[PDB]
Amino acid sequence: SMEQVAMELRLTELTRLLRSVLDQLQDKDPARIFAQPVSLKEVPDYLDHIKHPMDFATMRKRLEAQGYKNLHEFEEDFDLIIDNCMKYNARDTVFYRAAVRLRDQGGVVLRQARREVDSIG
C-alpha cells in the first residue's frame, strides 16, 4: 500500500538520523572500550553479572536492520552500554571512567537528537 511505503520512508530516515547519532556517540569512545561485545573467552563470568549485554557493534547491526522503531529504543541500548559497564567495573577503573565520560559527552548529542526527531516527526 502507499501508506506502508510512506511508513517505510520515515523509518528509513529515522535510521539515517540515528546512524549519525551513533557515529557521534561512538566518536566519544576514542579508546573503543564499548566498540565490541565483551568476550566470554576473556571474561568467562560476564553473563553471571550482566543479563543484557550491549556494545556499539551490536547497536549498529540492529540499526542497519532498521530495528529501532523510535529514539527511545535506541537510547535504551545506549544506556545499557553505560550502566552495564558502571556495574561490572569498579569506580577506579579506566572502564568505569570511560562510561562516565561517554554518558556526559553523549547527553549533548541525544538532547539534540530528541528535538530533531520531534521536529521532523
From the list 2-10, 33-41, 63-71, 100-108, the region that binds ligand 8TP by CB under 6 A is: 33-41
Decide whether 89 or 105 has the Cβ nearer to ligand 8TP: 89
Residue tagged 547497536 (cell numbers): 59
CB of 63 to ligand 8TP, least distance (A): 19
CA-to-CA distance for 54 and 104, rounded, in angstroms? 18
End-to-end CA separation in angstroms for the chain: 21
Q: Are 42 and 88 in contact (CB under 8 A)?
A: no
Please give the residue ranges that form the binding site for ligand 8TP (CB under 6 A): 33-34, 38-39, 42-43, 85, 88-89, 95
